[PDB]
Amino acid sequence: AKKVFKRLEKLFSKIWNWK
């Protein structure tokens, strides 16, 4: 399936570190 969406959640975590 196209649930790469999960990997996107990980990248979102990195944004929290920069935020």
Q: How was this structure determined?
A: NMR
What whole-number distance in Å separates Cα of residue 17 and Cα of residue 4? Answer: 21
Residue 5: how many CA atoms within 13 Å on its side-chain side? 3
What whole-number distance in Å separates Cα of residue 18 and Cα of residue 7? Answer: 18
Which helix (DSSP H) or strand (DSSP E) does residue 16 occupy?
helix 5-18
Structure tokens at 8: 């996107």
Which helix (DSSP H) or strand (DSSP E) does residue 9 occupy?
helix 5-18
What whole-number distance in Å separates Cα of residue 12 and Cα of residue 7? Answer: 9
What whole-number distance in Å separates Cα of residue 14 and Cα of residue 16? Answer: 5
Q: Residue 10: left (phi > 0), alpha (psi -120 to 50), or beta?
A: alpha
What whole-number distance in Å separates Cα of residue 19 and Cα of residue 6? Answer: 20
